[PDB]
């Protein structure tokens, strides 16, 4: 019937050709359309083994999207590697849209199922698609945002060679808002978030993470060090580059105490001098464009490390993580693999 | 064609901080982390911690607690640790180690530098 | 906090003639176990990975093989440069090291 392989897939999205918005535009140069009436086959009977760890369709993604960025964003300088390139850096419209990935003639996506699949081993409710569902390319560090929930219960994906795992991914199954402004100094903002929301889920994460490590003692505490790109919660916001600390959003002592209902308000920093997510060296970018700067969007997912290097009678210690975006796509692409005909 | 070239040996004072340096080249430096290694005379090798230099992140070994720090500057591809509080004990050849690593674990190492000799006396 | 350990810490083998290097972990490690070489003056060097995969530029006469918590570098007929010290390390919980075996020359 089918192998495993690999290909190239080709990408299909809504993107409008009226629309500057650079995800548009590239789309618009780079996707057809959707599938209107798109098709699934469920496949009787069938148990198929998936690793999203070891899927091709990541690397894929991964090329797509840096190609849009390396289209789309003007940095006035970019600092790669020996070089200093000075170019003209307009403000620009950005806004990501879903990207759906399909396959070419000979080959099928299968998809898993199961509710509560990790990501790596048998699926037993597999069926047969022609393209993924539409996945948003964010760009984040610490906190997934903007993706897809786990169905039922929250799920920890990682790999399951070693105990020396690089990146933990949570899969929540409920998502929670958070509301970032640069108001109307230009570069001083503020992420606010629910508080008595986040600390809910963030004890049921603690429970699974409990769950999953030998039932030990769930301790967080502050990235280890690095770029600020991970240090904190790092992202863009309609073009410009926002870092947030988190500190308050892994408060141990909110799982009940005081102070830990209402509204928590991280604060933020917009920076025009960046570490690139590519990997490629440091890009600069013009001031704040004027106005009230607001991005509103889901968490749907937290990105961790566990310390490695202390003793662990009774805990635990994990920090947030993220920084190779390879984990981003991940998290929405673990479900799929491309097998050939 | 892997290299780790090192820097930084020669006599420490007690009480005094450390800085040695580690060169690579010869692969992408973002992609693989890096191991700091010591074995001290008559001691067996003993992991201090790793840098992932793509980010920075770093974890430490405990015995090590609050004296080790792991930093590196990226446009140089160069790898830097610190020691402080330095004791007769940190005696010891210092190694740089690159390790090998899938999507999602960190296994076994498959390059070592030459090391460095430290001397920690008054 | 596995602990490897190597015994014994001092092997006296005639050149040519077989030898066989023994790790015991005080806990299971899967197979994630290797095997490095440390000659005098020189930086240490990976052998065997995975317990039983041998590394680039490798000859033939490595051999690493072991389950659970008892592993083993069998070398089929010792080289001159092959007397030498030797590390085993795990890798399946944190990075931890055997103290060592030197195999010496008998005569």
């Known amino acids: 019937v089918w192998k495993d392989a690999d290909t190239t897939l080709f990408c299909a999205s809504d993107a409008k050709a009226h629309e500057t918005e650079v995800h548009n535009v590239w789309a618009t140069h780079a996707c057809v359309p959707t599938d209107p009436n798109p098709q699934e086959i469920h496949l009787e009977n069938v148990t198929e083994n998936f690793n999203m760890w070891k899927n091709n369709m990541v690397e894929q993604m991964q090329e797509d999207v840096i190609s849009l960025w390396d289209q789309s964003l003007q940095p006035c300088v970019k600092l790669t590697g020996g070089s200093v390139i000075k170019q003209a850096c307009p403000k620009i419209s950005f806004d990501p849209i879903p990207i759906h990935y399909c396959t070419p003639a000979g080959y099928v996506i299968l998809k898993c199922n199961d509710k509560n699949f990790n990501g790596t081993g048998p699926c037993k409710n597999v069926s047969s698609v022609q393209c993924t569902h539409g996945i948003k390319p964010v760009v984040s560090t610490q906190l997934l945002l903007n993706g897809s929930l786990a169905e039922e219960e929250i799920i920890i994906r990682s790999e399951n060679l070693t105990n020396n795992a690089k990146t933990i991914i949570v899969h929540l199954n409920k998502s929670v808002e958070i509301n970032c402004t640069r108001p109307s100094d230009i570069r001083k903002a503020y992420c606010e978030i629910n508080g008595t929301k986040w600390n809910k889920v963030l004890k049921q994460v603690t429970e699974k993470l409990k769950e999953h490590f030998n039932n030990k003692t769930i301790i967080f505490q502050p990235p280890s060090g690095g770029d600020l790109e991970i240090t904190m919660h790092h992202f863009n916001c309609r073009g410009e580059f926002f870092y947030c600390n988190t500190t308050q959003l892994f408060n141990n002592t909110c799982i009940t105490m005081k102070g830990c209902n209402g509204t928590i308000t991280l604060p933020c920093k917009i920076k025009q001098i960046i570490n690139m997510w590519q990997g490629t060296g440091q890009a600069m970018y013009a001031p704040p464009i004027d106005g009230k700067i607001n991005c509103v969007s889901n968490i749907t997912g937290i990105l961790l490390t566990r310390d490695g290097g202390a003793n662990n009678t009774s805990n635990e210690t994990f920090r947030p993580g993220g920084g190779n975006i390879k984990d981003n796509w991940r998290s929405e692409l673990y479900k799929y693999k491309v097998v050939q005909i | 064609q892997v290299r780790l070239l090192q820097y930084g040996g020669g006599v420490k004072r007690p009480g005094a901080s450390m800085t040695i340096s580690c060169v690579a080249s010869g692969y992408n430096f973002n992609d693989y982390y890096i191991h700091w290694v010591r074995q001290a005379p008559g001691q067996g090798l003993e992991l201090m911690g790793w840098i992932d230099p793509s980010g920075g992140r770093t974890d430490y070994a405990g015995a090590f607690g609050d004296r080790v720090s792991m930093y590196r500057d990226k446009s140089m591809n160069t790898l830097y640790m610190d020691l402080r509080s330095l004791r007769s004990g940190d005696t010891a050849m210092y190694y740089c180690?690159?390790?090998?690593?899938?999507?999602?674990?960190?296994?076994?190492?498959?390059?070592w530098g030459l090391g460095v000799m430290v001397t920690v006396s008054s | 906090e596995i602990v490897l350990t190597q015994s014994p810490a001092t092997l006296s083998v005639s050149p040519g003639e077989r030898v066989t290097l023994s790790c015991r972990a005080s806990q299971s490690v899967r197979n994630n176990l290797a095997w490095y070489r440390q000659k005098r003056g020189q930086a240490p060097r990976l052998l065997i990975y995975g317990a039983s995969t041998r590394a680039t530029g490798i000859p033939a006469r490595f051999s690493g093989s072991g389950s659970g918590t008892e592993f083993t570098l069998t070398i089929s007929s010792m080289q001159s440069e092959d007397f030498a010290v030797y590390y085993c390390?795990?890798?399946?919980?944190?990075?931890?090291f055997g103290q060592g075996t030197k195999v010496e020359i008998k005569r």
């Open positions: 390390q795990q890798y399946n919980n944190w990075w931890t």
């Open positions: 180690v690159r390790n090998v690593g899938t999507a999602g674990s960190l296994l076994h190492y498959d390059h």
